[PDB]
Amino acid sequence: EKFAFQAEVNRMMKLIINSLYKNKEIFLRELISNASDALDKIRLISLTDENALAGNEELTVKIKCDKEKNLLHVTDTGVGMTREELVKNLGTIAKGTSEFLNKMTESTSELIGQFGVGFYSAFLVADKVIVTSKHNNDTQHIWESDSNEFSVIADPRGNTLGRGTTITLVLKEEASDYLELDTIKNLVKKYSQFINFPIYVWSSKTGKTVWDWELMN
Ligand SMILES: COC(=O)c1c(O)cc(O)c(Cl)c1CCc1cccnc1Cc1ccccc1
């Protein structure tokens, strides 16, 4: 169940980390951007497959802070990933990666977005990254990484997502402020403005305090 990262992924994790030390908040943009692209894919699939959205009818992005356990959750109802795609897409890279070797070493915020490798910016703010995904062609699995290795396991809780992906970030000590509602709300509203899917933040209202999904875009 344990795996090592491909060498090129190790180098890129260091490149992204070292070049975006100033602008850590971009991690939320990339996670939102990846969520939208996953929703696009299942929408395309639903054009030809009448059953594509049977595991989960809504097409949303839902973001949730868990302050007490130091966790941030980004859940989309996109196409999801099979066990094989978790291992392959997250631990290996392809194809033009090797031109992208020189391009990044030689601003770099736009580059990671173009080449679709923004996922690894999560390690700017997280000591551990956990990816829970459920694809129509497979059972729910869990991918977990501290960047030194990764493991993929079948999810003993079964199919809780229906369809899609949860990115769970165990936030670093100095990234504690990505646990505060107002920070997440303002970042989400900033980076979600042009996402063509609804994006919600689990938020508070006011004499008692009530929690519910608040639409941000
Ligand atoms: C299927 O996508 C997800 O489940 C998903 C998701 O639903 C949310 C996310 O934050 C991420 Cl990172 C993913 C995995 C994306 C990824 C990360 C690293 C390398 N390749 C890929 C391939 C890809 C797939 C769909 C959309 C965009 C990219």
Q: What is the DSSP string of the chain?
A: -EEPPPHHHHHHHHHHHHHTSS-TTHHHHHHHHHHHHHHHHHHHHHHH-TTTTSS-----EEEEEETTTTEEEEEE-SS---HHHHHHHHH-----HHHHHHHHH---HHHHHHTT-GGGGGGGTEEEEEEEEE-TTS--EEEEE-SS-EEEEE-TT-S-SSSEEEEEEEE-GGGGGGGSHHHHHHHHHHHSTT-SS-EEEEEEE----EEEEEE--
Q: How far is CA 135 from CA 27, 71, 72, in A?
A: 24, 23, 22
Helices 26-48 and 181-191: angle between axes, nearest 10 degrees: 60
Experimental method: X-ray
Resolution as reported, in Å: 2.3
Domain count, the chain: 1
User: Going by CA atoms, what residue is nearest to atom 20 of ligand 1?
Assistant: 89
165 within ligand 1 shell (Cβ under 6 A): yes
The Cα 75–Cα 161 span in angstroms is: 9
Q: How far is CA 216 from CA 149, 152, 161, 162, in A?
A: 35, 32, 22, 23
Which residues, other chains included, contact 177 with Cβ-Cβ below 8 Å and sequence gap of 6+? 183
The Cα 146–Cα 164 span in angstroms is: 22
116 within ligand 1 shell (Cβ under 6 A): yes
Which residues, other chains included, contact 1 with Cβ-Cβ below 8 Å and sequence gap of 6+? 151, 152, 153
78 within ligand 1 shell (Cβ under 6 A): yes
Q: Domain range for residue 13?
A: 1-217
Nearest Cα residue to 80 out of 27, 136, 130: 136
68: CA distance to ligand 1 center in Å?
27
**Residues ending a continuous segment of the chain before a break (C–N > 2.5 Å):** 95, 106, 206
Residue for token pair 């009818």: 57
The first and second tokens of residue 113, run together, are 């977005």
Does residue 182 have a known ligand-binding role? no
- Ligand 1 atom closest to Cα of residue 93: 19
208: CA distance to ligand 1 center in Å?
38
The Cα 70–Cα 162 span in angstroms is: 25
The Cα 8–Cα 197 span in angstroms is: 33
- Ligand 1 atom closest to Cα of residue 167: 10
Nearest Cα residue to 200 out of 215, 210, 188, 212: 215
Which of the listed residues 31, 37, 73 should we mutate to test ligand 1's pocket, taking the one with most ligand atoms within 8 A of CB?
Answer: 37
User: Going by CA atoms, what residue is nearest to atom 1 of ligand 1?
Assistant: 80
The Cα 158–Cα 142 span in angstroms is: 11
Domain CATH for 84? 3.30.565.10
Does residue 119 have a known ligand-binding role? yes
User: Parallel, antiparallel, or unpaired for β 61-66 and 199-205?
Assistant: parallel
92 within ligand 1 shell (Cβ under 6 A): no
Does residue 197 have a known ligand-binding role? no
21: CA distance to ligand 1 center in Å?
23
86: CA distance to ligand 1 center in Å?
9
